[PDB]
Design an enzyme around this catalytic site. Structure first.
Site, mmCIF file in Angstrom:
data_model
loop_
_atom_site.group_PDB
_atom_site.id
_atom_site.type_symbol
_atom_site.label_atom_id
_atom_site.label_comp_id
_atom_site.label_asym_id
_atom_site.label_seq_id
_atom_site.Cartn_x
_atom_site.Cartn_y
_atom_site.Cartn_z
ATOM 1 C CG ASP B 166 -1.915 1.146 1.223
ATOM 2 O OD1 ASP B 166 -2.420 1.510 0.143
ATOM 3 O OD2 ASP B 166 -2.152 1.706 2.318
ATOM 4 C CD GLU B 407 -0.375 -5.451 7.233
ATOM 5 O OE1 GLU B 407 -0.851 -5.635 6.088
ATOM 6 O OE2 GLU B 407 -0.729 -4.496 7.962
ATOM 7 C CE1 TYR B 463 -4.774 0.779 10.267
ATOM 8 C CE2 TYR B 463 -3.924 -1.445 9.852
ATOM 9 C CZ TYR B 463 -3.756 -0.060 9.845
ATOM 10 O OH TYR B 463 -2.571 0.493 9.413
ATOM 11 C CD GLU B 501 0.943 -0.832 9.389
ATOM 12 O OE1 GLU B 501 -0.229 -0.893 8.953
ATOM 13 O OE2 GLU B 501 1.937 -1.189 8.728
#
Lengths: 586, 586
Positions: B166, B407, B463, B501
């Site tokens: 990303d 990740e 998240y 994150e």
């Protein structure tokens, strides 16, 4: 005139070493640095990148808004092989005023924040060792130096800058710094002038050296092939089937200046030049004897975080935007830019009106400016900056005109006598004697202005549709604009007119139907009204919109995070009005 | 180990000359460059700033989105006195792949776009003359090198990068370029390790040279006074009353590595280091034997126009903002940064998790990513980049941890066997054997993951409140988050956990009452829910928010001009949630 303005190069006779990077930095609000021996090192420094403006790094008001004395320091290793050479520190600029120290010794002082500063450190330099440079800088504004303004003292004693101009008082070491080594006898300056002769062209030159040995001048074409050669400090080089430097189509020859003693070469300087002529004939602006219409913008050296700091990345993007709009010209408002801009303009074939920092000569943060007793001193630093600018930029093919003021008071005889001395000085310093002008504000009415006769062409800043009428009154704005232009026309001066400023503040994203003054739609309607007016007069020969991009200003109730008259945003993206220019200029 | 990762310096034995500036540039979509002799000069080049990413200068889609082969060229003058020296080209990086040519001759190739490239040009270099460097670079993405992705070919033949990560696929010459001269026998590498003994400290070192002459190592304090000296390529420097390097309170010694000749010195290398120890004890992270709680951000090398191009001004503003938020730490997500970031971190006392570009190890445009036939190849370049990163960064006091992945898939034994070799490689190359880790995505469920035992501490990207149960479901998000954390707790690993994150996309200016996903208020509420969860678990020892600043990504329906999970805007101004970090971290 006591040092060379020549851009540093690297060859067998000349060396250069960059000093860009993190310097040491310290504010000096009590103005005690010199008594305290800071010229031998800063006691409590923070880190500061060079080149850059210091203001936008900090997260508190007092450091961002600092006005007064502040200091820079760095160290650098001098190669042993630089020994008996003339060793100089070259600052692209020191904004606004400064004194250079090297190894604890005072070297030189300079006034004016947008032109090179050279410090001869030959006697104090230490080859084969680490050396130290310390700089004391002051960023205050006054009426005896350019650009003009005032300094306010708050009731805690801290100073505040009060510009008479509309841009943020960024300062510091905003351009690159070099340490360089020159031969003991070196080329100090040169000037070139051009004459077109059918298929051929004449390059007239003169060279200044720091010695008496013979000078040899050669011309190489863009492929390095010799096309002309002569001996002596003055001469004429003849070029067969000359490849002229053209708008948006550059061709650059290379001039090579050699100092020789019959045995060997003592010095060599090279620079790229372009064979081109500029002149005014009647209401025409002639480039290589052909009428040209100026299409472009006034710009600023301005970018997020960096301030006025130079960066090639900014040059590249700005030129890609300029080309995209089909522009051919910009004005270096309101100060000489870093030299690299002109180099790039030379290569891209762009035309430049080169502007001296003569802005803020109307005392407002009719003002009877030019009648203060400080004006004689103002005049001499104005003439000084003009001398420095013209000496440094004159050999750039891209530079077609000198702008010697922006919006001063011109409606009295004091103003005429002031600017007469400046124009006289400028003409003596320019070997090519290219066109000279300045940008006039509206108060300089055709019936009242006394300075426009000094100009080879006339530059107007007009905001009919913004500061004058505008919004619901824009139809009245056009009538007022045509009325002034009719009065200029009736004077029958037979000179070209160029609009150097016109625009509207525009918030990216503000859309309104029908349009309102701050919306993107209003910007287009305003531009198209102005275009109709421009195109109604034969003597109008250029349009430079204000501004290329949104830029930082002093904060106040009329500036929403700076000036938004940009056609591009501060991060270089086009507002809707950008396409208007693109289609018209195509 | 094939070349020196050492940062270039200038002294009596080592020379350096910057090659930063405007280079020449040419796209090669038909891939005909080598056959057409472009290694001797580009036929139709445009101008390109170095350092910067090339993508954001242009004004048309095809050049911005270019994927394939493209070329750089410049010329530079080599001083004559470099005649009998080892001469190297040093690129800060070449993204992603490249072949370096010098004076028409092929010199070296490199794979991996975020670490230094060294090209030995001794045999072809021409001292006392102008020399040429040409670089062929390729920016395509594949699954055998880092970062991972794919290349799509459109039906006009045009290539398009398809990242598994990303962030925008910036490339080019993004960091500084030097030409340097080293003595024939030189210091090639060195390592330091620390032990604290009451008021004193031992600096363990090893030195690698390209010869057999004796080595003497000196330590100087911050004022240049000798505090320690030892002889031999392996040894101990003893520092009495050592001033330790501390978390927001740096102190730097200066190490001096000398190669000697009995009567003379042959080479000298200097660098600043900090005396500090790092280790994990239980669920605590100990710096100088005291627990530290990591607070800060994941960052990117990203800035308007420049892309990943390095500039000191970005460094200065970002650190000024970091200090304002009271952070002590950042992760170099998702690749090694320019070396200058580490230098500045050392100076400001910041802690760094140094991250290898192992991002995109989940084939996403369970993916069986580690069962492909290409995984052995990937592993070799993953290991190669780990070695180069560690070799280059191991001596920065600020670097306290290696992050070996971001990740990936971790729930099979293939993944375990892959990462076991990476971790062994990292420990083998790190002289200090400091903590090693990686960032886990939520698919690595605690009952399924097989890779967390490899880690000295565990980094989680979560998240809850954004991708998982966002908006009206945020209470359920908290329940899910506590449920996952309860499961990790039950495992009783007795290791520290750090959240690497967490964040929400937030539009500057978007206000809603009540808040909505993407609003400034929601970012604040999301953060505060996450804090409550974090503080409920004893083994949580760090929070690195995602992201420090808005950054450029691939365009798509889920990215509104890049990633907006930044707490600061791309022009480095704080959103409402920035003060929330500021108050908490104080």
């Amino acid at each position: 005139l006591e040092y060379s303005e020549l851009y540093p190069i690297q060859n067998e006779y000349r060396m250069m070493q960059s000093l860009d990077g993190m310097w040491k930095f310290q504010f000096d609000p009590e103005e005690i640095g010199k008594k305290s021996g800071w010229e031998n090192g800063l006691p409590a420094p923070v880190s500061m990148p060079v080149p850059s403006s210091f203001a936008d790094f900090f997260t508190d008001h007092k450091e961002r808004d600092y006005c007064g004395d502040f200091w820079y320091e760095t160290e650098f290793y001098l190669p042993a092989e630089w020994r008996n050479k003339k060793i100089w520190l070259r600052f692209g600029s020191i904004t606004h005023r400064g004194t250079v120290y090297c190894n604890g010794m005072e070297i030189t002082s300079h006034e004016g924040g947008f032109l090179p500063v050279l410090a001869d450190i030959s006697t104090v330099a230490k080859p084969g060792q680490v050396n130290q440079v310390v700089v004391k800088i002051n960023n205050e504004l006054n009426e005896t130096s350019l650009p003009c303004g005032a300094t306010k003292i708050l009731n805690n004693g801290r100073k505040l800058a009060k510009p008479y101009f509309d841009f943020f008082n960024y300062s510091g070491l905003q351009r690159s710094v070099w340490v360089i080594a020159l031969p003991e006898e070196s080329v100090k300056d040169y000037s070139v002038d051009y004459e077109l002769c059918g298929t051929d062209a004449l390059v007239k030159y003169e060279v200044v050296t720091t010695g008496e040995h013979p000078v040899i001048v050669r011309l190489l074409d863009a492929e390095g092939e010799l096309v002309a050669e002569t001996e002596g400090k003055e001469g004429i080089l003849q070029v067969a089937n000359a490849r002229l430097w053209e708008v948006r189509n550059a061709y650059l020859y290379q001039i090579v200046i050699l100092i020789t003693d019959g045995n060997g070469v003592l010095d060599e300087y090279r620079e790229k030049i372009g064979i081109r002529t500029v002149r005014i004939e009647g209401t025409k602006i002639l480039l290589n004897d052909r009428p040209v219409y100026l299409k472009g913008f006034g710009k600023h050296e301005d970018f997020p975080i960096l301030g006025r700091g130079f960066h090639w990345g900014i040059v590249k993007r700005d030129f890609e935007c300029l080309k995209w709009t089909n522009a051919n010209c910009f004005r270096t408002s309101h100060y000489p830019y870093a030299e690299e801009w002109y180099q790039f303009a030379d290569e891209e074939g762009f035309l430049i009106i080169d502007e001296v920092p003569a802005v803020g000569m109307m005392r407002s943060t009719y003002t009877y400016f030019f009648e203060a007793l400080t004006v004689p001193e103002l005049l001499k630093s104005h003439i000084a900056d003009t001398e420095e600018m013209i000496t440094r930029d004159k050999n750039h093919p891209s530079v077609i005109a000198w702008s010697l003021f922006n919006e001063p008071e011109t409606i009295t005889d004091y103003a005429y006598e002031y600017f007469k001395e400046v124009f006289a000085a400028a003409e003596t310093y320019d070997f090519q004697s290219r066109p000279m002008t300045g940008a006039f504000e509206k108060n300089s009415k055709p019936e009242l202005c006394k300075c426009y006769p000094l100009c080879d062409f006339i530059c107007l800043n007009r905001y009919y549709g913004w500061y004058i009428s505008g919004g619901p009154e824009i139809e009245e704005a056009e009538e007022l604009f045509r009325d002034e232009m009719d009065r200029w026309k009736a004077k029958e001066l037979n000179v070209p007119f160029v609009f150097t400023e016109f625009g509207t503040d525009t918030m990216a994203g503000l859309h309104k139907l029908p349009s309102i003054m701050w919306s993107e739609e209003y910007q287009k309607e305003y531009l198209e009204m102005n275009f109709r007016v421009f195109d109604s007069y034969e003597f109008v020969q250029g349009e430079l919109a204000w501004n290329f991009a949104d830029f930082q200003t002093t904060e106040g109730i009329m500036r929403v995070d700076g000036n938004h008259k940009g056609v591009f945003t501060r991060d270089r993206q086009p507002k809707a009005a950008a396409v208007v220019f693109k289609d018209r200029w195509e």
